């Protein structure tokens, strides 16, 4: 499966909707793996971090 | 900060506890970034995905 497909899911979550052209000029694989991964672990850690409380407090 | 520090938390979340030696023999940065990124994306896309319902349904 194309890596872009997975990264696409992040494109919307990390910053869905915009105006400026996304364009593209990544040096290699790491370049993309740098921002998406560094961000993913944090986002991944974020959802899980709040998820523990979300189930507890919840919301009407 | 070392990348492993970030990939470590993922190590426990992606599969905490085991038996077989983790070892190590990654070609470069990508190699690690290949699994950790691709995973954390859906991983974050997962928690984020259920969190929306968790707040709602929650649990006694």
Swiss-Prot record, chains A, B:
Type I modular polyketide synthases (PKSs) catalyze the step-wise condensation of simple carboxylic acid derivatives. Organizationally, type I PKSs are arranged into modules, wherein each module is comprised of a set of catalytic activities that is responsible for a single elongation of the polyketide chain and the appropriate reductive processing of the beta-keto functionality. A minimal elongation module contains an acyl transferase (AT) domain, an acyl-carrier protein (ACP) domain, and a ketosynthase (KS) domain. Involved in the biosynthesis of antibiotic erythromycin via the biosynthesis of its aglycone precursor, 6-deoxyerythronolide B (6-dEB). Homodimer. Erythronolide synthase is composed of EryAI, EryAII and EryAIII multimodular (2 modules) polypeptides each coding for a functional synthase subunit which participates in 2 of the six FAS-like elongation steps required for formation of the polyketide. Module 1, 2, 3, 4, 5, and 6 participating in biosynthesis steps 1, 2, 3, 4, 5, and 6, respectively. This is Erythronolide synthase EryA3. It comes from Saccharopolyspora erythraea.
